[PDB]
Amino acid sequence: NRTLTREQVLALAEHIENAELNVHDIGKVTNDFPEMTFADAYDVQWEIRRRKEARGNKIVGLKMGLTSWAKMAQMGVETPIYGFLADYFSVPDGGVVDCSKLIHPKIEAEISVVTKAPLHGPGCHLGDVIAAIDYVIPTVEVIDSRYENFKFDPISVVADNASSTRFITGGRMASLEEVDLRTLGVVMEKNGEVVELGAGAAVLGHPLSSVAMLANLLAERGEHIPAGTFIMTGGITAAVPVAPGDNITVRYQGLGSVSARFI
């Protein structure tokens, strides 16, 4: 399942994290370790998590990447990917993101869930997830691949924590009974203009499925989704570059809006 030595995992994690911490893009790691499997990549990502926990960061949630059947097929993968969210990733609705701490950030409109019951795989699917949802909450992610490379590389991206870097919760919380996630419309505005549109169904056909896929992915490593877990279910719209001076508002049908100022 794995081709990296443990020393390589540790060194890769340090190297990839350092790119984030030092705001310094690096070559995608699969160029130097072309044999890396997803298990290697997750070993690396999880070691990054450890490095963050070790210096006292709290891990406050999980995020999903590649939550598009089309994109999965394009990238030659059969499942989404996930990454973790550190406490300092969090930005208040309307808050400021300091781009000088970021490399080449993009924002995406997502819907997050907080669970109220444990979920696990393998074999988790939508039906298992429904009963476990406490509420949903509009969330914009700021993603920022630490790689200098143009073309998306799933295994490198995983090693780089699915490009996670900031997330902004906002809008209004709602129970599942109050929202239809498949038809929940989102409008992303940047500097006063509509730049992207999407509906919840853009996430796998049903954003809650993202949670189940997460459960099954975590099961591959003998982990699950504890109750109370905050999960960003995936990009509803295309990701949009942001730069200093940009202001963005993402409007969620019936859920208010999430905004952020970039400096």
Ligand X SMILES: O=C(O)CCC(=O)C(=O)O
Query: Residue ranges for the binding site for Mg(2+)?
Result: 21, 108, 110, 141
Instruction: Please state, in angstroms and rounded to a whole number, the distance separating the CA atoms of residues 252 and 256.
Output: 5
Q: Which of residues 108-147 bind ligand X (CB under 6 A)?
A: 141, 143
Percent of the chain as helix, strand, coil, to the nearest 5: 30, 30, 40
- Reading the block at residue 253, the tokens are 């049908």
* Span near ligand X by CB under 6 A; candidates 39-47, 65-73, 124-132, 212-220: 65-73
Nearer to Cl ion, 35 or 98 (CB): 98
Q: Which of residues 84-103 bind Cl ion (CB under 5 A)?
A: 97-98, 101
Binding site for Ca(2+): residue ranges? 108, 110, 141
Work out how close the CB of 6 gets to ligand X at its nearest, in angstroms, rounded to a whole number.
26
Which of 250, 255, 93, 249 minimizes the C-alpha distance to 184? 255
Binding residues among 105-164 for Mg ion as defined by CB under 5 A: 108, 141
Going by the annotation, the residues of the binding site are 21, 63, 66, 108, 110, 141
The Cα–Cα gap between 144 and 139 comes to: 16
**Cα(126)–Cα(105) distance, rounded to whole angstroms?**
31
Q: How far is the CB of 238 from Mg ion (least distance, A)?
A: 11
Nearest distance, CB of residue 186 and Mg ion, angstroms? 13
User: How many other CB atoms sit within 10 Å of the CB of residue 226?
Assistant: 11
Taking the C-alpha atoms of residue 32 and residue 138, their distance in angstroms, rounded to an integer, is 38
Q: Contact between 97 and ligand X (CB under 6 A)?
A: no
Taking the complex as a whole, the smallest distance from the CB of residue 92 to ligand X amounts, in Å, to 20
Three-state DSSP class for residue 90: strand
Angstrom distance (rounded) from CA 50 to CA 63: 17
Residue ranges in contact with ligand X by CB under 6 A: 63, 65-66, 71, 141, 143, 157, 162-163, 235
Give the footprint of Mg ion on this chain (CB under 5 A): 108, 141, 235
